Amino acid sequence: SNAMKTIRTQTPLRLGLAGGGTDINLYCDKYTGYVLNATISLYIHCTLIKREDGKIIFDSPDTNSYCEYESKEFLGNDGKLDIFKSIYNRIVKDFTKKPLSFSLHTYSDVPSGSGLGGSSTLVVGVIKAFAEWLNLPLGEYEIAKLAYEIEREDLGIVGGAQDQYAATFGGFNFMEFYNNKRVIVNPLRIKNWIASELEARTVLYFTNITSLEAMHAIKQDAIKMKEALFRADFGTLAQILGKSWRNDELERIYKLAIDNGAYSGKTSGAGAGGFMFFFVDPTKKYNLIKALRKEQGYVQDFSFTKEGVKSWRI
Amino acid sequence: SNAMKTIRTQTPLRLGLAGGGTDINLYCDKYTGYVLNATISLYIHCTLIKREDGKIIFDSPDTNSYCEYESKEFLGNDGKLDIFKSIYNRIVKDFTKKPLSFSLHTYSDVPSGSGLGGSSTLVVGVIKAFAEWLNLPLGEYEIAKLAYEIEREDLGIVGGAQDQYAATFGGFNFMEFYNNKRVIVNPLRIKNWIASELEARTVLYFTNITREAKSLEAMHAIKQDAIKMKEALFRADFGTLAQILGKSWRSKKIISEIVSNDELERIYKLAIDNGAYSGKTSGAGAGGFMFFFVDPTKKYNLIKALRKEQGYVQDFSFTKEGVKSWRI
Ligand SMILES: [Ca+2]
Secondary structure, three states: OOOEEEEEEEEEEEEEEEEOOOOOOOOOOEEEEEEEEEEEEEEEEEEEEEOOEEEEEEEHHHEEEEEEEEEOOOOOOOOOOHHHHHHHHHHHHHHHOOOOOOEEEEOOOOOOOOOOHHHHHHHHHHHHHHHHHHHHOHHHHHHHHHHHHHHHHHHHOOOOOOOHHHHHHHOOEEEEEEEOOEEEEEOOOOOOHHHHHHHOOEEEEEEEOOOOHHHHHHHHHHHHHHHHHHHHOOOHHHHHHOOOOOOOOOOHHHHHHHOOOOOOEEEEOOOOOEEEEEEHHHHHHHHHHHHHHOOOOOOOOOOOOOOOEEEEEE | OOOOOEEEEEEEEEEEEEHHHHHHHOOOOOEEEEEEEEEEEEEEEEEEEEEEOEEEEEEEEHHHHHEEEEOOOOOOOOOHHHHHHHHHHHHHHHOOOOOOOOOEEEEEEOOOOOOHHHHHHHHHHHHHHHHHHOOOOOOOHHHHHHHHHHHHHHHOOOOOOOHHHHHHOOEEEEEEOOOOOOOEEEEEOHHHHHHHHHHHHEEEOOOOOOOOOOOOOHHHHHHHHHHHHHHHOOOOOOHHHHHHHHHHHOOOHHHHHHHHOHHHHHHHHHHHHHHEEEEEOOOOOOOOOEEEEOOOHHHHHHHHHOOOOOEEEOOEOOOOOOOOOEEE
16 A cells, blocks of 8 residues: 655644733742744645665755755754754654664745744654654654754744744643743633634735733733633634734735724734734625735735644655 | 624535546446545635615625615526525525525635636535524535525536535545436545645646647446545555546546647646646636646645746645534
């Protein structure tokens, strides 16, 4: 039937829906913030193929990067796909203890610099390919953690492994922070129609153009959003999501969207050439999209996904 | 809180993955042929809002059409969205026995003319909106029948309720035809990775082309290809599945539709040059499309070459569900 020497993984990107931060500790319990994100149907795809010629190949055509090295236990940096070397180097140090021969191929559904957690989604996607291929004893949590440490070695990170949790666990996740280091992830069960209604009121547009009283009400905003989520209260949810969102080329298109129905708008990234996310009445969604198609950027349809990284062998 | 006087429905379009025809007494079963289709993440969206002013509004902006009438039992035809009148008229004749007041708003994720089951998908989404709103005793099969009756009678389609069952039931459906009458629908339970693997191997491209001035025994192996394709699906045998899909795609009606046009033939060529190893052209009309099979490690470069052409690549997933609805 199948040769079974090929592994593939598919890892979704995510949208920050809301968030509050108090990097400065003050609460009686050391609460430093919250984020509500949700994975969407835009992915990073990886394919890993076993080889037998003692070669290692890293192929990432969406970044115009291709590498071929001789198989060995440690790959030194050469400024090309160094993130792949760190991952490989770690897998060998911690689990296999010997070199491997294979080809790794990857691409993203969105151009580089989109701000949907692409760097972490990739790392997670690639680690899962190795884990599935090598039968490594690593649960979803251990994967997100390993992804965080690898990213930490090559660059500095704040907010803990939140992006890695989104990519690994998927769905809507409500994250609570303590001492700007500890992260408590609440993977939420959201009724399907809630996601469906949110999708019906949403437009995602890529632009293609690369105080203290507020801080102290953050915890209560969180309780209110969570409360609105389990009650499936859209009035409130829409009321607080719109709030959480309260000169450039971005401001012109924001104006253009509101003049065509959008009642709320938000950017993120890389807050410039990334994307704009709008809320609109579904009976107005089509006209809005038609207007935006006329501009420089493009509208990207998507749905919220229920799961995180998946993998399979063929 | 929520007002609860609004109903929304979302209905997926479908993709014909494979099919074959055998007419008719070639078998002692009266096996007409088969079709294997699967719903995808491109949808028709419907919103139905109750209003208390004796008005009936039909709003379809993707087709630049807007109708307004007075609430009554029967709405005669006038050339603007006559499809919604037939649906409305039938809901009143067979269920409510009285006039209704509401506004109906719809739109599709794909342009007019596409060969993805657009008409059946629309009728199903609307019927479902009324059923949910009025609490009609209608299961999914009953909605597909109603959709089929309305579509054959008040239009002129023939060939079976294929498209209505796909939109209503969703997922992968293998349909067998007997004596051009009995459609046996096998709603397949498919391992999720099969779907994921198929998605990894495929590219959907809308052409935006406008054409200009440029067997007697092999047909008997069709019923064999069907049982072979079911077995491969059940077995999750992707090596054999790719192989059999590959075959049915080289018929005559596929290769003819490709070659019968210089610009489509050029696009096919360009796709094979860039990684595709198989493709078909469907509903080659106002908004035709090509569907390709490609090596996943080559898909990005294929997509990249296609994005430089006048058409556009449409990402999608295979979906598990058929029509869904909710009240808000
Ligand atoms: Ca490193």
